[PDB]
Amino acid sequence: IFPKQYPIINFTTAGATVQSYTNFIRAVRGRLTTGADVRHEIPVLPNRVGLPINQRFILVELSNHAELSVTLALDVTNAYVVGYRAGNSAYFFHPDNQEDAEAITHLFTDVQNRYTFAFGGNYDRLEQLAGNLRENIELGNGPLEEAISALYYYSTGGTQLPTLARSFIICIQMISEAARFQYIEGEMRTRIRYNRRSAPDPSVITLENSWGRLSTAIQESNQGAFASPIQLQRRNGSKFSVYDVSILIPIIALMVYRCAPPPSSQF
Ligand SMILES: Nc1nc2ncc([C@@H](O)[C@H](O)CO)nc2c(=O)[nH]1
Numbered sequence: 001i002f003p004k005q006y007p008i009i010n011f012t013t014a015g016a017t018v019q020s021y022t023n024f025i026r027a028v029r030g031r032l033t034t035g036a037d038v039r040h041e042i043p044v045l046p047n048r049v050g051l052p053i054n055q056r057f058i059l060v061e062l063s064n065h066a067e068l069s070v071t072l073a074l075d076v077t078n079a080y081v082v083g084y085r086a087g088n089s090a091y092f093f094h095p096d097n098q099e100d101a102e103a104i105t106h107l108f109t110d111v112q113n114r115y116t117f118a119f120g121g122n123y124d125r126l127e128q129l130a131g132n133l134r135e136n137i138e139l140g141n142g143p144l145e146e147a148i149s150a151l152y153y154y155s156t157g158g159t160q161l162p163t164l165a166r167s168f169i170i171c172i173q174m175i176s177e178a179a180r181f182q183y184i185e186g187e188m189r190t191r192i193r194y195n196r197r198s199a200p201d202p203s204v205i206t207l208e209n210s211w212g213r214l215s216t217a218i219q220e221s222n223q224g225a226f227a228s229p230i231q232l233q234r235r236n237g238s239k240f241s242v243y244d245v246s247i248l249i250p251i252i253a254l255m256v257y258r259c260a261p262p263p264s265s266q267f
Contacts (some may be wrong), residue, residue, distance in 0.1 A: 004054040007031050008071070009035045010061040013145045018189045031058045031177050032076055033254055034264050039219055040245045048099075049079040049256045053106045057082070060175060065145055068152040073107050074173065078256050079176040081121060081168065082107070086152040092123030121168065122262055123208075129165035134208075135199050137169055140191035147171050153185040173200065173208070181207050206233040207251070215255035218245050 009031060011024040033043035058074040071085040079127040082104060083092030094117055095101035119125045127133050147167035154164050178185040187204055191197065210232065217226045229241035242248060
């Protein structure tokens with residue numbers, strides 16, 4: 001066996017409902033947050049510094065309607081999708097630094113074929129590759145059915161990288177963004193409830209883009225007040241400003257670690 005098999009959380013597109021999608025996202029969230037380190041009620045993701053590699057990754061087994069499966073690697077410290085495995089191959093985005101390049105070797109070690117892409121996995125590289133921006137890519141259970149198939153066929157040549165980058169973007173939103181924001185799990189539940197496939201709107205896209213910033217402002221907010229107004233976007237593109245963490249408590253599910261557990265405050 002490898003020294004600690006990282007936790008795997010399974011999900012299927014096969015008979016999905018709002019109940020099985022909520023379950024899956026609760027589980028994933030419950031795998032990521034320390035439990036403790038609750039800043040003004042939001043759980044903070046564990047600091048990358050004193051984190052042992054045998055605690056670094058969560059694996060998500062994405063099954064499918066035609067019994068094809070993909071296993072994604074999730075980085076606990078930010079819920080980032082760092083790479084994936086399909087059949088006997090494993091592919092990882094290009095790491096952003098040496099430390100990450102190092103850690104990534106402890107992932108799917110039993111695969112025969114490992115590949116590290118030339119490009120990184122952030123939305124900008126991926127939108128350019130997909131040749132289609134996030135607001136023009138559809139989300140919902142049918143798009144996720146299509147994504148898992150694409151990732152699995154990349155191994156046996158039904159590649160086409162535009163389609164593969166598009167499939168990663170779809171998968172990053174319905175899994176890591178849904179976990180980061182209670183708001184975005186809500187958009188996906190509606191698409192699954194009505195069996196809709198719709199692109200994300202401005203309120204959804206700006207939350208994705210502002211998560212780091214939100215984590216820093218909530219962690220350095222004085223008492224509950226943001227030391228300067230953060231503007232978000234409405235679903236119609238109107239900007240508005242949030243000045244206080246309470247507005248965001250039903251919105252953001254977890255935060256990336258930025259500052260010191262306060263002094264304590266948990267008990
Ligand atoms: N591979 C992969 N790529 C990503 N790119 C951007 C973001 C965003 O959530 C950033 O926080 C801001 O755009 N998340 C991810 C992600 O989890 N996985």
